[PDB]
Design a protein around this ligand. Structure first.
Ligand SMILES: *[C@@]12=NC3=[C]C([C])=C([C])[C]=C3N([C][C]([O])[C]([O])[C]([O])[C]OP([O])([O])=O)C1=NC(=O)[N]C2=O
Length: 104
């Protein structure tokens, strides 16, 4: 599936891993995404009430499933059924955030 892995222990919670289907779906190149916060997929038509939720889940560090509007590198807009999950891989502490993306 399309998914990425982010490391919240780094400044701005950057994408450190992105599956191939993800790069296919967004039309970007691995060199472009890696190191960057995912928000670069949002645009003028993206609902901010949705982006607010995502922001909450992240800070509060919980799971969430939000439908958000994104734009490929080319400029084409698409619906993104986004699901968030926490890699509590630790012993309480959050180590990674896993995100699954689906063009819907
Ligand atoms: C992005 N996918 C994505 C994947 C993971 C694993 C995480 C943690 C977040 C995302 N986002 C959200 C984005 O990075 C950010 O959390 C929000 O924009 C809110 O924070 P800011 O600081 O910007 O207010 C994703 N956002 C997208 O729009 N598309 C994805 O595919």
């Amino acid at each position: 599936k399309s998914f990425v892995i982010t490391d919240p222990r780094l400044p701005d919670n950057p994408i450190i891993f992105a599956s191939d289907r993800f790069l296919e779906l967004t039309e970007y190149t691995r060199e472009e995404v890696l190191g960057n916060n995912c928000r670069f997929l949002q645009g003028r038509g993206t609902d901010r009430k949705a982006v607010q939720l995502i922001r909450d889940a992240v800070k509060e560090q919980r799971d969430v499933t939000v439908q958000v509007l994104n734009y490929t590198k080319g400029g084409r807009a698409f619906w993104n059924l986004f699901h968030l999950q926490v890699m509590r891989d630790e012993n309480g502490d959050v180590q990674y955030f896993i995100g699954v993306q689906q063009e819907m």
